[PDB]
Amino acid sequence: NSIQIGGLFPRGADQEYSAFRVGMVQFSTSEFRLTPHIDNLEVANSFAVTNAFCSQFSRGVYAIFGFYDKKSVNTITSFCGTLHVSFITPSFPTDGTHPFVIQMRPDLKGALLSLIEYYQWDKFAYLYDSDRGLSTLQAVLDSAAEKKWQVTA
Amino acid sequence: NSIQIGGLFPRGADQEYSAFRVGMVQFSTSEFRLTPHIDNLEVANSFAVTNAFCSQFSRGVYAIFGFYDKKSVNTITSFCGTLHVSFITPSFPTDGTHPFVIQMRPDLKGALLSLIEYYQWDKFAYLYDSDRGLSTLQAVLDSAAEKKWQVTAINVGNINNDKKDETYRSLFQDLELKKERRVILDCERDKVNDIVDQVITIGKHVKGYHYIIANLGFTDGDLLKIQFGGAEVSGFQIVDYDDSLVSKFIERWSTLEEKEYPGAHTATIKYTSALTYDAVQVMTEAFRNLRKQRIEISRRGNAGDCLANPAVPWGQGVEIERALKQVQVEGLSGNIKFDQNGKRINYTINIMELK
Amino acid sequence: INVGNINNDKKDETYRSLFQDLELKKERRVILDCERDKVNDIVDQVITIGKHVKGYHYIIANLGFTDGDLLKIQFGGAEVSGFQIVDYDDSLVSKFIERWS
Amino acid sequence: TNGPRKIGYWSEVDKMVLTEDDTSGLEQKTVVVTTILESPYVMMKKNHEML
Secondary structure (H helix, E strand, C coil), X not given: CEEEEEEEECCCCHHHHHHHHXXXXXXXXXXXEEEEEEEECCCCCHHHHHHHHHHHHHCCCCEEEECCCCCCHXXXXXXXXXXXXXXXXXXXXXXXXXXXXXXXXXXXXXXXXXXXXXXXXXXXXXXXXXXXXXXXXXXHHHHHHHCCCEEEC | CEEEEEEEECCCCHHHHHHHHHHHHHHCCCCCEEEECCEECCCCXXXXXXXXXXXXXXXXXCEEXXXXXXXXXXXXXXXXXXXXXXXEECCCCCCCCCCCEEECCCCCHHHHHHHHHHCCCXXXXXXXXXXXXXXXXXXXXXXXXXXXXXXXXXXXXXXXXXXXCHHHHHHHHHHHHHCCXXXXXXXXXXXXXXXXXXXXXXXXXXXXXXXXXXXXECCCCCCHHHCCCCCEEEEEECCXXXXXXXXXXXXXXXXXXXXXXXXXXXXXXCHHHHHHHHHHHXXXXXXHHHHHCCCCCXXXXXXXXXXXXXXXXXXXXXXXXXXXXXXXXEECCEECCECCCCCECCCCCEEEEEC | CCCCCXXXXXXXXXXXXXXXXXXXXXXXXXXXXXXXHHHHHHHHHHHHCCCCEECEEEEECCCECCCCCCHHHCCCECEEEECECCCCCCHHHHHHHHHHC | CCXXXXXXXXXXXXXXXXXXXXXXXXXXCCCCCCCCXXXXXXXXXXXXXXX
């Protein structure tokens, strides 16, 4: 058997793409030859991500793998929520319990908030960047209100 | 002439769609005839927004009216940013200076910070609905450092309707651990109503509490029931009923039949609907300016496909964007001007307060 | 204080005025000795003027403490108390209430 | 807060009798303080048997 898969990689993701290739050289077998349709387009651009996603649908690949950003995640989770195409990604976890998206990165929130209690912190700055989802910020803000901390976000 | 225009409307935007039709009835002209095509799909479902966009894009519409939400906004902004099809909306301002987005809802963050200064606040709660986007939570927290405030920000959005009784109680009871009294409500009026209804039910509208309704619809909520609590309430409205044009509109608006224009048979109008009505004026005025300037809109009806690769911009959309961002008119929302980013400038917001 | 002859056509500011006059004395303990359909209306105005936070205490001086729309003052923190002649703990009453409802 | 509850009963002969289920009863408690009788820190007042 041969099994086409979508590969939807950011430009400059070489160390993850090399790990994809090395992973493919490791795990693949002649019985079911996973065959990447690689695409390299601006992942922060929803048009290019959607256009490539439609093309990788148009070649009937059985699954798609790739990375996304806080801009494009509202496309991927909605297309996969519609065409039922299963998308596997290690990028930042989606907040909703969206079907047909597999996210390999674990939830950081509980571990970070536990470390704060282990350190017995009560007043700290929280500098943050939007482009991984503000789920982390919301969890420290909600906890700080409950735990009567102060945060200089 | 007749002009094909696109339309995506949220399911339940009955007063906005009514205001759109009223705008067409008011601002139509024999010379050029704006001819809507309307699609009604879930604005929060980016696939549906994408599909309806590409359908209306395949129709070759010269501009699209509609709305977007924090999920689909990255589709509409990026597609239009690429396809040069101007998108006109009353939705919240985009964070970026995206070209081809004509966004009516003026900057609230600046007015919000100035009012919080005006009340001399230093420690307060700030309740935000996550789903409108956190651009206002950013701008208050950025200043809270410099202004040495103690913003107790809390997410209130993801509280599900099945249990939206104990949670609002619990939410304010947790604030009563700090004994917070000053509160900002940063929600759509469908959520400001619900939280105010719980605020009265938990009794926290006596003297001492003070709520700021950080939206452009201070009068559009069910305000009456906190008018007499003894607390104070204040906020903002973009529409000013003192204007003669607004009053003349409101008479023409309230007198409509509710069968044909549902939700229009009232002496009040949602700011979203008012910006919609103003939007139809602006779209007419831009195409009027094209015909004043003898600009040709003549993109062929066989406009192509949204998925066409390589991408296929079109020249006339640039001229449409140039005109749209240069129109100046009065409307329900007062004087309008646009910057090159399509955000409004030289406007004014009416600060309202509940005595 | 008489509260009966406040007519339905103007039963809005008269109740606010009524409690504002009590707030001259700063009264807090109140007996509502009214019929059910008037307990509802005055309790509804009692929330709207904000006077159901803890500190107030209303006695519903009728045999129908549970029969009015009690729920909306359950949470304000002003304690409320009164009387009921029927007791739903009785098996005969429970069997009746099933047969009744 | 949990809803309308009984707290007692009344009759013409049985003047108000509570059901001995009042939550208020418990909550407010008092620390036990241990000390020793020595002057002038802790001493018995002349009228202590009336107190």
